[PDB]
Amino acid sequence: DGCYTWSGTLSEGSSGEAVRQLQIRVAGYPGTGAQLAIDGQFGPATKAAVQRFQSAYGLAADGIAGPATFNKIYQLQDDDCTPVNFTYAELNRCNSDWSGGKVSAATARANALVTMWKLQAMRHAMGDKPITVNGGFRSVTCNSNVGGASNSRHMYGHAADLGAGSQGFCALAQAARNHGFTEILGPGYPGHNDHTHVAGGDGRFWSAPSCGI
Ligand SMILES: [Zn+2]
Helix, strand or coil: CCCCCCCCCECCCCECHHHHHHHHHCCCCCCCCCCCCCCCECCHHHHHHHHHHHHHCCCCCCCCECHHHHHHHHHHECCCCCECCCCCHHHCCCCCCCCCCCCCHHHHHHHHHHHHHHHHHHHHHCCCCCCCEEECCCCHHHHHHHCCCCCCHHHHCCEEEECCCCCCHHHHHHHHHHCCCCEEECCCCCCCCCCEEEECCCCCEEECHHHCC
């Protein structure tokens, strides 16, 4: 028993860290073209996300976070709080301290953590096949070494660059639309034919012309 343990049921009207932690876990279920706010307040958007999560794993979908809902999260949660199929190291091929960015190392890792939970949801929705992560966090040095953009969300811990795997670039960019990625760049967008870029953060910008987006 390590990362986090929920003490009791959560429903609309609840507020606190327990709510903030659950929002992270279900951040991959905000509805198409939406983003869940991680504010610690259990409102209607939070109930909807929970319902979607419950449905995705064949639990009773009532939108109430009870003990069965927590037992499923416990099955997807690693010691360090990351989901079972993604790790911090896989999300940072830059350095080992998450320093260098446009925000704190702790803010960078927390932003990363949400991205991991969104990827976990997407991994299951796509059929439980491995999703290849090619890059994630980039300090300012790392970003320049790549010739990245000055504004790049990579330096915030919000983005991940995905390789084709058995899904293909387009399948990944299309599904990303359902999992809280406000920024998606892929095939047909300049410098994005050899990977699919997904990122969280404010402001929606979707472009992958070769994929129909
Ligand atoms: Zn990228």
